């Protein structure tokens, strides 16, 4: 049995075309199309808040050109 | 149609117990268990080289406590 370390890196910006009525999951689903990360392994953040899958972008005042942050969440 | 930005972040270290005979894919499969990233969306790097899925850790002189780097690769 061999022990190694893996340092994970991601530091990129992606643009999404979405609707205010979209849930955080529908956003997580668009993200999954780009980066392949399962939505249940994405933690989305905006303006100091962690975003909840069942709630909509409109519920967080996410608007045109808002910057969301995506943290990869291990399993 | 609304436009937003998603900034992706990952900056963590993971430990893997592997075998020198393991392919980069078998490593990518252990990684996928932890972080959920599909292996075909992982770019593994070691010591300035990009690692090839069909080749083994032994082929790159990956040994005990080697530090591999994982770059998330979009789709």
């Amino acid at each position: 049995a061999m022990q190694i370390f893996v340092r994970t890196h991601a530091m990129r910006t992606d643009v999404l075309e979405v609707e205010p009525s979209d849930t955080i999951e529908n956003v997580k689903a668009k993200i999954q199309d780009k980066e392949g990360i399962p939505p249940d392994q994405q933690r989305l953040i905006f303006a100091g808040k962690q975003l909840e899958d069942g709630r909509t972008l409109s519920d967080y005042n996410i608007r045109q050109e808002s910057i969301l942050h995506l943290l990869l969440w291990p399993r | 149609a609304m436009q937003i930005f998603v900034r992706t972040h990952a900056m963590r270290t993971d430990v893997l117990e592997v075998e020198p005979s393991d392919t980069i894919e078998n490593v990518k499969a252990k990684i996928q268990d932890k972080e959920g990233i599909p292996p075909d969306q992982q770019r593994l790097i070691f010591a300035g080289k990009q690692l090839e899925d069909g080749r083994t850790l032994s082929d790159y002189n990956i040994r005990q406590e080697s530090i591999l780097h994982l770059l998330l690769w979009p789709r």
């Binding site: 933690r43 953040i45 910057i67 291990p74 | 963590r12």
Partner: peptide, 19 residues
């Protein structure tokens, strides 16, 4: 885990001014 919580804290911090 400790790493994930520290990263979460870092990114929440960052989002306070990068939104």
């Amino acid at each position: 885990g400790q790493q994930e919580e520290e990263d979460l804290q870092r990114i929440l911090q960052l989002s306070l001014t990068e939104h």
